[PDB]
Amino acid sequence: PDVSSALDKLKEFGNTLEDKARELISRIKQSELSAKMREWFSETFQKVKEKLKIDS
Amino acid sequence: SSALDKLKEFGNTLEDKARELISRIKQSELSAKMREWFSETFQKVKEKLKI
């Protein structure tokens, strides 16, 4: 058996998990930006419609 | 934007569990290396002392 190789494997895993978890956070923030901009485009076009409509 | 802000807490949770895991692996490592070392030392002492 290889107790030393097993532990080193887990440190490797542990260290990657910690770095990828940080990267997950950034992908969430990207979709957040996406979702918020979709909300903003719709809202603002809604306003445009209304403003023209109440002016023919 | 609910699914996002609490998914962020998810990232933070994974990050903390990662660190914790590493801390624990290192402690296991120290423990095993001390166990091997003590055992080897005792063994050599035994041999030099003819039981």
PDB file of C-alpha atoms in Angstrom, chain A residues 6-45:
ATOM      1  CA  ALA A   6      -3.039   8.478  -1.122  1.00  0.00           C
ATOM      2  CA  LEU A   7      -2.603  11.512   1.098  1.00  0.00           C
ATOM      3  CA  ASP A   8      -0.881  13.462  -1.644  1.00  0.00           C
ATOM      4  CA  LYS A   9      -3.779  12.630  -3.949  1.00  0.00           C
ATOM      5  CA  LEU A  10      -6.258  14.071  -1.452  1.00  0.00           C
ATOM      6  CA  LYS A  11      -4.228  17.230  -0.934  1.00  0.00           C
ATOM      7  CA  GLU A  12      -4.303  17.644  -4.654  1.00  0.00           C
ATOM      8  CA  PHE A  13      -8.043  17.173  -4.750  1.00  0.00           C
ATOM      9  CA  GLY A  14      -8.509  19.465  -1.713  1.00  0.00           C
ATOM     10  CA  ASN A  15      -6.421  22.196  -3.327  1.00  0.00           C
ATOM     11  CA  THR A  16      -8.190  21.988  -6.726  1.00  0.00           C
ATOM     12  CA  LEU A  17     -11.633  21.988  -5.029  1.00  0.00           C
ATOM     13  CA  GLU A  18     -10.705  25.166  -3.183  1.00  0.00           C
ATOM     14  CA  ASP A  19      -9.625  26.874  -6.432  1.00  0.00           C
ATOM     15  CA  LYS A  20     -12.565  25.661  -8.513  1.00  0.00           C
ATOM     16  CA  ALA A  21     -15.048  26.728  -5.837  1.00  0.00           C
ATOM     17  CA  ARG A  22     -13.730  30.252  -6.296  1.00  0.00           C
ATOM     18  CA  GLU A  23     -14.265  29.884 -10.055  1.00  0.00           C
ATOM     19  CA  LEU A  24     -17.848  28.698  -9.538  1.00  0.00           C
ATOM     20  CA  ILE A  25     -18.506  31.973  -7.737  1.00  0.00           C
ATOM     21  CA  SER A  26     -17.369  33.939 -10.762  1.00  0.00           C
ATOM     22  CA  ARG A  27     -19.610  31.932 -13.136  1.00  0.00           C
ATOM     23  CA  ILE A  28     -22.582  32.624 -10.848  1.00  0.00           C
ATOM     24  CA  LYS A  29     -21.730  36.336 -10.951  1.00  0.00           C
ATOM     25  CA  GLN A  30     -21.571  36.152 -14.772  1.00  0.00           C
ATOM     26  CA  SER A  31     -25.096  34.665 -14.952  1.00  0.00           C
ATOM     27  CA  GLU A  32     -26.146  37.296 -12.422  1.00  0.00           C
ATOM     28  CA  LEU A  33     -24.875  39.970 -14.845  1.00  0.00           C
ATOM     29  CA  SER A  34     -26.663  38.247 -17.672  1.00  0.00           C
ATOM     30  CA  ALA A  35     -29.962  37.953 -15.779  1.00  0.00           C
ATOM     31  CA  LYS A  36     -29.835  41.528 -14.512  1.00  0.00           C
ATOM     32  CA  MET A  37     -29.177  42.893 -18.021  1.00  0.00           C
ATOM     33  CA  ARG A  38     -32.107  40.936 -19.420  1.00  0.00           C
ATOM     34  CA  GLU A  39     -34.282  42.474 -16.708  1.00  0.00           C
ATOM     35  CA  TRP A  40     -32.919  45.909 -17.597  1.00  0.00           C
ATOM     36  CA  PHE A  41     -33.476  45.577 -21.388  1.00  0.00           C
ATOM     37  CA  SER A  42     -37.067  44.416 -20.955  1.00  0.00           C
ATOM     38  CA  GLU A  43     -37.964  47.011 -18.308  1.00  0.00           C
ATOM     39  CA  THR A  44     -36.520  49.826 -20.401  1.00  0.00           C
ATOM     40  CA  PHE A  45     -38.179  48.715 -23.602  1.00  0.00           C
TER      41      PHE A  45
END
